[PDB]
């Protein structure tokens, strides 16, 4: 598969969540990410030094990456950056940005309240990052003037000049992507009566956040190393590399760019409108116009499914798939790709009940047995047997599909000009057929039980169905009305141990759910066990003998 790397192999012990500082975004970035045009060196098929591989990851499958070498299955993407023309909010933090504004003075960047207020020091005391901010906010949202002189911690006769600035504070209410405040004012003490109404610029808010004291934002949710409030407002944009937004290159001459590759081009275009718009003869209205648009493009790229309607619909009516939407539950990254997964070494078929199978076994069709494989390692113990299975080929029942050398290289017994003469060396792996008596995980969805997934013994059988013992129907919730079930094959000698030693059907016999057995004798057997056990019921020797023989443990008495 992937190649040897000298790098010390460890495990992720902690995950330290933080925020990107434009500085980092710049540093880590292998390219910027200047032109919306994907590739085609002016129609000439190969990537452009502008978007996707301006030193980023790679396309072509052949033709390795421009930063590391390795290529495709090895190379995780290499990050990019676009230097935004004007600071823009992060669609997500937009509410917290408002709440931070509501906490601090919009002029000197000092907390509206401090250690001088008792209900404030009470909140400043709260141990929890989130609960603390929540309490601070509730007290600070009420303060509409940055105090110059507060009454002393003893008398209201003498006043202490706690902090600078006297300025009146706005009443910030959001106007979707825009934060617009309404200041009280004064005018012969009266005003308001008719206040002052202006939108607060991303840049102004950013400048207030930059001036927020380490200790002040530290009292708020924030961290001086990983999450400074100023980092909620975006200046430098990380450009995710091809693997995040794959170019589905169907046939030779035909692209097929991902949704994100499109939305980025849109952010890029909108940024270049604004870039030149302001530098040149800035008609100052089309300036805040091209801005609101860039703010929209960066908003909908991260979240398209926002309150204030506009679905940023791809020219097809179909709305653009936001990154937020990608990770969003039951299907999509977290819920459906990580917590749940599609798996190799799995099988499914119709289940039919068998009276001649021991409780703990499962009838696996010959086809399924010949498809699914187990990686056995050439050991003096097996060696000879494995050579016979290799020799036998992938088409017989006991046989093998592949042989894996020391040189981690796969031999396809199915084709290999050597499948006949192939001398196995110890330590090689032989991916052989699911043979009788292997542990396997048998399963029936839904799966509300420890017992809805049990470990069975293989028994390779003819005919296309999975055959299971009737008594084990009850814990799966199976019936033979046309139900299908799943089979998972363990790959490790250690994993086989897990199933055998913990998940086995004989073990699962007495359920802790009810402190009573979960399987019993059922149907034909249950009806017949009464029918046989009545006093009126007697058996002649002829049948008594056959009935005795039939019990495999019979003592011959």
């Amino acid at each position: 598969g992937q190649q040897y790397s000298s790098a010390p192999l460890r495990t992720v012990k902690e995950v330290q969540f933080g925020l990107f500082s434009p500085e980092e975004v710049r540093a880590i970035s292998v390219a910027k990410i200047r032109f919306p045009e994907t590739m085609d060196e002016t129609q000439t098929r190969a990537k452009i030094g502008g978007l996707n591989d301006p030193r980023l990851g790679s396309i072509d499958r052949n033709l390795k990456c421009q930063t590391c070498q390795e290529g495709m299955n090895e190379c995780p993407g290499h990050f990019g950056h676009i230097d935004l023309a004007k600071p823009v909010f992060h669609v997500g933090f937009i509410a917290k940005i408002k709440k931070v504004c509501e906490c601090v003075c919009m002029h000197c960047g000092k907390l509206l309240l401090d250690e001088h207020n008792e209900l404030m020091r009470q909140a400043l005391a709260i141990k929890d990052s989130k609960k603390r901010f929540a309490a601070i906010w509730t007290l600070c949202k009420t303060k509409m003037v940055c105090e110059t002189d507060v009454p002393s911690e003893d008398d209201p006769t003498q006043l202490v000049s706690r902090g600078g600035c006297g300025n009146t504070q706005p009443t910030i209410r959001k106007d979707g992507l825009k934060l617009v405040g309404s200041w009280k004012k004064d005018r012969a003490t009266g005003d308001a009566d008719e206040p002052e109404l202006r939108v607060l610029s991303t840049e102004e808010i950013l400048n207030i956040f930059k001036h927020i004291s380490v200790k002040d934002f530290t009292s708020l949710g924030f961290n001086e190393v990983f999450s400074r409030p100023e980092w909620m407002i975006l200046t430098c944009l990380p450009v995710p590399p091809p693997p995040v937004r794959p170019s589905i290159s169907f046939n030779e001459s035909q692209r097929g760019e991902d949704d994100l590759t499109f939305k980025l081009a849109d952010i890029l275009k909108a940024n270049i409108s604004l870039e030149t718009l302001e530098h040149n003869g800035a008609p100052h209205h089309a300036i805040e116009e091209a801005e609101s648009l860039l703010q929209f493009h960066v908003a909908t790229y991260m979240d398209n499914d926002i309150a204030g309607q506009p679905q940023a619909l791809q020219k097809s009516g179909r709305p653009v798939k936001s990154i937020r939407a990608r990770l969003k539950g039951k299907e999509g990254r977290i819920r459906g790709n990580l917590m749940g997964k599609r798996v190799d070494f799995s099988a499914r078929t119709v289940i039919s009940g068998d009276p001649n199978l021991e409780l703990d076994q499962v009838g696996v069709p010959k086809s399924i047995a010949k498809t699914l494989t187990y990686p056995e390692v050439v050991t003096p113990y097996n060696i000879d047997r494995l050579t016979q299975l290799v020799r036998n080929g992938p088409n017989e029942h006991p046989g093998a599909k592949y042989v894996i050398r020391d040189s981690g290289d796969r031999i396809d017994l199915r084709y290999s000009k050597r499948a006949g003469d192939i001398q196995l060396q110890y330590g090689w792996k032989v991916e052989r057929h699911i043979m009788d008596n292997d542990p396997v995980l048998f399963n029936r969805q839904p799966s509300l039980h420890k017992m809805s997934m049990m470990a069975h013994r293989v028994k390779v059988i003819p005919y296309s169905t999975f055959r299971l013992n009737l008594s084990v129907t009850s814990p799966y919730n199976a019936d033979f009305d046309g139900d299908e079930m799943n089979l998972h094959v363990p790959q490790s000698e250690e994993t086989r141990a897990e199933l055998s030693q913990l998940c086995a059907v004989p073990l699962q016999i007495v359920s802790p759910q009810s402190n009573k057995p979960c399987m019993g004798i059922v149907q034909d057997t249950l009806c017949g066990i009464r029918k046989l056990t009545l006093r009126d019921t007697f058996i002649e020797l002829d049948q008594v003998l056959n009935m005795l023989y039939w019990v495999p443990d019979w003592d011959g008495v």
Partner: protein
Amino acid sequence: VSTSTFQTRRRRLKKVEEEENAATLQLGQEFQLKQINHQGEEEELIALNLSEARLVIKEALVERRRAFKRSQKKTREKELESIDVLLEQTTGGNNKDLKNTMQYLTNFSRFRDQETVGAVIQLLKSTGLHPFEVAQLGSLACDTADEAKTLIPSLNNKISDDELERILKELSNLETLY
């Protein structure tokens, strides 16, 4: 996989302010005067002067050769050829570094005999100088207190010009003759 040390510090995200290292007695993080060991105790940094150095490797490779044969049960130019033998016995050969090191050490050792090395260490270690200076004084041969204070500029006001000279005088007397 590389090698790690007792120095357990955790610079989280905070890359740099990686100090320039000079004999302004500012050795690396790794080479701090105050440091730990496998036993978990604090211990003063170990610095060797050649010969005090040459004898360590000598000893270690000898006790190693003891075990290489224990488990296998069930005059300057003249010492040079003798050392090249011990290296062929206990070292991987691929370690051409230790060979060059031993040849250098053999020819550049100020004090041959151990008795002498022990006595050098007593003389210099009483001074209260930093281990890198107690090292440099034993390895570098000086006459003027100025010769010393120039090459080991870390001294300067640390020692008396006369007192440093008294040391240098006793060091030349100990100097094992070839």
